[PDB]
Structure 1
Amino acid sequence: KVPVVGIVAALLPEMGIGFQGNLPWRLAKEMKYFREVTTLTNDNSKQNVVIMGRKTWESIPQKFRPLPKRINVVVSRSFDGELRKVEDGIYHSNSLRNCLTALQSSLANENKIERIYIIGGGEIYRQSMDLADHWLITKIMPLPETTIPQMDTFLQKQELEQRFYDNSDKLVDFLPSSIQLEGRLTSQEWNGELVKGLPVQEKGYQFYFTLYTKKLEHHHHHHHH
């Protein structure tokens, strides 16, 4: 009932997302997008959830966690069950799947969550291809003089483009209404792939905010009683 949206920054063409437990770039504008999208709501009485794997949690600077103004959920197989408050702003879960089911309960949530963002990292995203309704992907490209950074963790692009299509024509409409983006929508070829979305440049990179949406599905079965 509430949308589940994976949100990720990935370097084309392999969709690398990390190296040695850290982000491979430090891009203040990309970080401001991530901050605004995950914080902002259309309805002022609601908040978003951000769900993350334990290793991703551990990498957020201690000063800056839990991420303000959002319900933070950290998942670890060493935690107690499926959604437990552990501190102000912090829930622990031992299951990505059961966590999402628990968050969807209208009785538990009082319909006061807008969206559930899955914010990383590699192992969490792998498991989220069949759970997310959408992906907000920032597609990052080194500008011609820029050294490609080393990376060790990747988005599963095959399974992405299996299940989802590039819906970036609708990105503006999908973002919380109050966000303001600097680009206009823009389709560019880059190493043999079509890159469509909202352009920024910062430091040695160009990046596009893009939206992926689930492909239409055939009606094979609906469960009857």
Structure 2
Amino acid sequence: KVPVVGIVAALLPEMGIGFQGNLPWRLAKEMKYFREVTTLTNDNSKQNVVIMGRKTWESIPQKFRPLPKRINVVVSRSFDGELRKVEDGIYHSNSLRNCLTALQSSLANENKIERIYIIGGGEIYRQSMDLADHWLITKIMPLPETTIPQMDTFLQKQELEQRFYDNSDKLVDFLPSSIQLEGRLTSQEWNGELVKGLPVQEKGYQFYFTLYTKKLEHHHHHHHH
């Protein structure tokens, strides 16, 4: 019952997110959004968790890891079990799924996690479509003059739009209430797709903060004793 939220910056239309182990852009404003969203809580006595794969961990500059003021979890199949403190601010897990179950125990967590953010990378996100309750996706578009950057890692847009709908009308309300956003909400056609969310521009790019929410489910089975 703590929300699990995938958070990702992706280039349209392919939803590219990475190239040779690194982000394909450096956008200070996007990074500020990610920082504030994953750090900030509505309740001052809680922190959020950020969960990431080993390769993503290794790409964060050494001065900036672990990410401050958030519980960091790194997942590697070569680690020891399902959630182990290895250093201040650092947990290792050998299982994305079992670490989420572990993080959800109110006995372990004392109800002092607000949200669990899944912060990448590709392999991790592949596995999170059936785990996340919401996705915060920054939809990035090169302006007409901008060279499209090369990329090698992609968000699974098909599987996204299967399970989730664009709930960006509720993005403002979904974010911790102290964040301040520059744009107003905004529906724009771009290459035949509808892009809705909160606009910024930086460097060669325009980008929208968007929110995706699980679609309604039929009631097929509830488990009884």
The TM-score, its normalising length taken from structure 2, stands at 1.00
Secondary structure class of the residue paired with 2:30: helix
Q: CA deviation at 1:73?
A: 0.0
Alpha-carbon distance in structure 2 between the residues aligned to 1:3 and 1:213: 11
The TM-score, its normalising length taken from structure 1, stands at 1.00
Secondary structure class of the residue paired with 2:171: helix
Alpha-carbon distance in structure 1 between the residues aligned to 2:192 and 2:15: 15
List per-residue Cα deviations over 1:135-185 (Å, max 9, x = no partner). Answer: 000000000000000000000000000000000000000000000000000
How many percent of aligned residue pairs carry the same amino acid? 100
- The CA RMSD measured in Å over matched residues stands at 0.1
List per-residue Cα deviations over 1:101-137 (Å, max 9, x = no partner). Answer: 0000000000000000000000000000000000000
**2:22 aligns to what?**
22
Secondary structure class of the residue paired with 1:223: coil
Q: CA deviation at 1:97?
A: 0.1
Alpha-carbon distance in structure 1 between the residues aligned to 2:3 and 2:99: 14
Secondary structure class of the residue paired with 2:103: helix
Q: CA deviation at 1:70?
A: 0.1
**2:170 aligns to what?**
170
**1:92 aligns to what?**
92
Flag structure 2 segments of 5+ consecutive residues without an equivalent.
Answer: none
Alpha-carbon distance in structure 2 between the residues aligned to 1:188 and 1:147: 21
Q: CA deviation at 1:27?
A: 0.1
Q: CA deviation at 1:220?
A: 0.1
Secondary structure class of the residue paired with 2:111: coil
